[PDB]
Design an enzyme around this catalytic site. Structure first.
Site, PDB file in Angstrom:
ATOM      1  CD  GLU A 392      41.294  38.963 -55.635  1.00 31.43           C
ATOM      2  OE1 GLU A 392      41.420  38.008 -56.428  1.00 31.43           O
ATOM      3  OE2 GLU A 392      41.474  38.848 -54.404  1.00 31.43           O
ATOM      4  CD  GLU A 401      48.787  42.186 -57.626  1.00 32.92           C
ATOM      5  OE1 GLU A 401      49.606  41.520 -56.960  1.00 32.92           O
ATOM      6  OE2 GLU A 401      47.608  41.830 -57.811  1.00 32.92           O
TER       7      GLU A 401
END
Lengths: 594, 301
Positions: A392, A401
């Site tokens: 993740e 991100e």
């Protein structure tokens, strides 16, 4: 619990009224600071020398009672947008006088009628009072859902746009008052309601109070007042927005002791979820449901990677990129137990502050099965080729991100038979109208930067006080591993969203959908929201100047994801119906640094 | 009896034997309650001790009128219409009823020509019609779009009354019809008066101070009498009546059918609220104001 108040235009003595009012359970009283029939002259002799006190003196109530239990009302004889010069100028001065007494008293809020089409002057008188150092006060513009010119009876000897113009009164007010945070709406309901397509817009406003006349309440078979279901739905939405409910009028149910109308609000507020419970309280960029779906995915992979007779001899190599504090490694291990398969694991984190935590896990719980790499996944010269890379690195907006640039960087130690988790993710956009989120964006005006750069940067938010104009469309798709040579994550995309009704646009909301593995999906898209998953909130992309739209149009928005070896960023522009300057050019306001 | 009275006198209404009725209210101060005062002598007013009867109300008084002889009807601040009886000797005042049927202030009240029924205009847009003997509202017509500033019951036809509002509408009403109201022909209307003989023709006053004469079948014969809002138009009891006009200009101008000014009184220091011609001297006009003066003007005719 519901909060409520009484709208009394008659107040003979304040302790007598507030005494009997509070006993009926109302939290506050809306009352006028001057008697509403007591006209005043200021420009015209000889009336301007009127002896005596102009109102009831503030000494009658303690400063705590004024600042908490009372709300002001502007006198009905005041028509500051009247066409007659002498009626206007006397009316400008009275409003200043009734508002400044609102300041001197310390009142928490003040009610100002909006019922006319043109309210340009009324805002000026209120724009001059805000800029006076009086911040302890609020303005509740009283605007109805349906105009008085439409709710009336058609019993006249002449024939009786037309549904939305109750809003355009308001939007032309706050726009004149520069979208001030000190101006809110008290929404006057009536027995006739508009379509739900409008209500969904009005709740995008800063509805801070709801004024409920007693004349909408029916009478049930027990003799007690109730609302028909088309109202009770609306009030259930208003309660979610936490507004204060004001009981205007008088007892038509004359036997029932007027407090009965309040009793039914204290009934509806009980008889009507965890995303709203967990969420509470804009920020610039313990969820086991989110990690289980990673676990079930790894389970669904390992059985698909490993035949049943190779269970004991197939060393399945997993690389948990972005392990962090190691919850994904507990999942990557629990899946093997759940799948009954041998795995060897390389947990990769750069951040030494978390390697300290992984390394403690390795010695306490996981054993030699778990390797830890201290170098980063883009530097590490690995000894063996992963069969799986699990991660993740996601964000509220999936390609944010640096999940792609990191995973596609960590692809040179993935087997050619191998897979990636999340294997695919696709971000989703929809336009939104939100006059409250826009002001919370301007509230980020920060010294020592360009005062408009706060619009060229996104904001993470539990969208609560917002309206959505269209079903979200996929913007950017990424699928890992990249089966191809050079071809770059620099992407261009265009989206056209239809529009139904007149409304301002204040930004585009980011969602995402991700396929961890086949038929296993994390998602925060509303139409496909994953259950009980709340770690990732949506994001807001603001725009420099709000865009006012006409129905039948299309909102055409262009986003870019652009990058170099140093920076990664987004750019966004609305070009239809109107051109908005290309936001965040060259990362001047926002980046996610490689 | 009440020991004190309020400064801001709001209404004045004679009756046939010349007795003067005042409605008085506190438009300031700690208590915005109000009072009714009956004077057998208009010249004894406004002094409390010289009256014949009077009583305090539990809420303001915005307007009042006469129901017959032994009764008074009152427009309250509290969104209610109160009927007050007089005593046998009319030294005391007694509530026939008090009823709260308005969601906002009772701005004006008028009685229909038969005396049994009353019309209460208001700021809570709905006009209502009252049965005074049964003490209940029969009708509630929400025809306007704003505050009904003033109304005028017809002086000959019981079912007919006027209404005007800040929406610039001027409506003729007939409660026998199925759609009772009908429109009569930029400045807003403030007050209306039927002509007591030409029952089909009336006058209105507007905020700009213009005064007008307009027929039901029609047109604006008018004059710029006042500088400020014409609060009231009142007709004398002559056979050939004289149109009293009183304004927020603190001046009183009296007119005739030509609308030319015959007399002007700037004696009031503040807003003139009401005017009522005496039955015992048709040249005598009595006024009251928020300056607390009770003035009797005698008019050259």
């Amino acid at each position: 619990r519901v909060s409520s108040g009484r709208d009394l235009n008659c107040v003979p003595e304040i302790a007598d009224t507030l005494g009997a009012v509070a006993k009926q359970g109302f939290d506050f009283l809306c009352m006028p600071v001057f008697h509403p029939r007591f006209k005043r002259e200021f420009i015209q002799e000889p009336a301007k020398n009127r002896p005596g006190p102009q109102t009831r003196s503030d000494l009658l109530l303690s400063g705590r009672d004024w600042n908490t239990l009372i709300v002001g009302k502007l006198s009905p004889w005041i028509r500051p947008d009247s066409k007659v010069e002498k009626i206007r100028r006397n009316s400008e001065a009275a409003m200043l006088q009734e508002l400044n007494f609102g300041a001197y008293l310390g009142l928490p809020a003040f009610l100002l009628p909006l019922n006319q089409e043109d309210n340009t002057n009324l805002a000026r008188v209120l724009t001059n009072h805000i800029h006076t150092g009086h911040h302890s006060s609020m303005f509740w513009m009283r605007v109805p859902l349906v105009a008085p010119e439409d709710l009336r009876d058609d019993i006249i000897e002449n024939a009786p746009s037309g549904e939305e113009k109750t809003w355009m009164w308001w939007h032309n007010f706050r726009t004149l008052c520069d979208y001030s945070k000190r101006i809110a709406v008290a929404l006057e309901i009536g027995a006739d309601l508009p379509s739900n397509h409008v209500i969904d817009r009005w709740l995008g406003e800063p509805i801070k109070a709801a004024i409920l006349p007693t004349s909408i309440f029916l009478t049930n078979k027990k003799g007690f007042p109730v609302l028909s279901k088309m109202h009770q739905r609306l009030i259930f939405r208003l309660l979610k927005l936490e507004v204060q409910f004001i009981i205007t009028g008088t007892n038509h149910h004359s036997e029932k002791e007027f407090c009965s109308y309040l009793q039914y609000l204290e009934y509806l507020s009980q008889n009507r979820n965890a995303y709203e419970l967990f969420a509470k309280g804009l920020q610039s960029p313990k969820d086991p449901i989110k990690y289980s779906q990673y676990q079930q995915a790894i389970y669904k992979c390992l059985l698909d990677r490993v035949p049943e007779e190779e269970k004991d001899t197939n060393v399945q190599v997993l690389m948990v990129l972005g392990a962090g504090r190691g919850p994904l490694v507990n999942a990557s291990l629990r899946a093997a137990k759940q799948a009954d398969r041998r795995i060897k694991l390389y947990a990769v984190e750069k951040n030494p502050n978390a390697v300290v935590t992984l390394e403690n896990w390795q010695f306490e719980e996981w054993g030699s099965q778990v390797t830890v790499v201290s170098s980063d996944m883009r530097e590490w010269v690995a000894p063996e080729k992963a069969d799986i890379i699990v991660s993740e690195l996601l964000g509220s907006f999936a390609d944010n991100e640096l999940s792609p640039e990191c995973l596609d960087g960590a692809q040179h130690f993935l087997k050619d038979d191998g897979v990636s988790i999340p294997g695919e993710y696709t971000s989703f956009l929809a336009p939104i109208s939100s006059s409250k989120l826009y002001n919370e964006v301007r509230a980020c005006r920060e010294k020592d930067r360009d005062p408009e750069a706060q619009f060229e940067m996104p904001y993470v938010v539990r969208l609560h006080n917002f309206h959505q104009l269209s079903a979200p469309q996929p913007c950017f798709t990424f699928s890992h591993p990249n089966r191809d040579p050079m071809i770059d994550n620099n992407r261009y995309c265009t989206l056209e969203f239809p529009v139904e009704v007149n409304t301002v646009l204040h930004g585009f909301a980011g969602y995402f959908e991700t396929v961890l593995y086949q038929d296993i999906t994390l998602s925060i898209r509303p139409e496909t929201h994953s259950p009980g998953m709340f770690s990732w909130f949506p994001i807001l992309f603001p725009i420099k100047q709000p865009i006012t739209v006409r129905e039948g149009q299309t909102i055409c928005v262009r986003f870019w994801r652009c990058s170099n070896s140093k920076k990664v960023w987004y750019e966004w522009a609305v070009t239809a119906p109107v051109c908005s300057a290309i936001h965040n050019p060259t990362g001047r306001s926002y980046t996610i640094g490689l | 009896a009440p020991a004190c009275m309020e400064r801001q006198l709001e209404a004045a209404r004679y009756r046939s034997d010349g007795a003067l009725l005042l409605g008085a209210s506190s438009l300031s101060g700690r208590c915005w309650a109000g009072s009714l005062w009956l004077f057998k002598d208009p010249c004894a007013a406004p002094n409390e001790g010289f009256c014949s009867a009077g009583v305090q109300t539990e809420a303001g008084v915005a307007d009042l009128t006469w129901v017959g002889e032994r009764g008074i009807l009152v427009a309250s601040d509290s969104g209610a219409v109160e009927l007050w009886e007089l005593d046998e000797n009319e030294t005391l005042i007694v509530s026939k009823f008090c009823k709260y049927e308005h969601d906002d202030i009772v701005s004006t009240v008028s009685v229909l020509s038969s005396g049994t029924q009353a019309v209460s205009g208001s700021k809570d847009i709905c006009i209502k019609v009252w049965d005074l003997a049964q003490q209940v509202v029969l009708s509630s017509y929400r025809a306007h779009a704003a505050q009904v500033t003033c109304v005028a019951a017809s002086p000959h036809k019981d079912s007919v009354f006027l209404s005007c509002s800040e929406d610039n509408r001027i409506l003729l009403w007939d409660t026998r019809c199925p759609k009772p109201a009908s429109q009569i022909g930029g400045y807003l209307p403030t007050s209306l008066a039927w002509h007591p003989q030409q029952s089909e023709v009336f006058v209105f006053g507007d905020e700009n101070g213009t005064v007008s004469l307009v027929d039901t079948k029609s047109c604006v014969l008018s004059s710029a009498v006042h500088s400020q809002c014409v609060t009231g138009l009142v007709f004398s009891p002559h056979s050939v009546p004289f149109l009293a006009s009183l304004s927020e200009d603190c001046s009183l101008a009296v007119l005739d059918s030509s609308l030319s000014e015959l007399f002007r009184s700037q004696a009031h220091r503040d807003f003139v609220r009401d005017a009522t011609w005496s039955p015992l001297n048709h040249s005598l006009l009595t006024t009251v104001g928020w300056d607390h003066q009770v003035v009797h003007h005698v008019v050259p005719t």
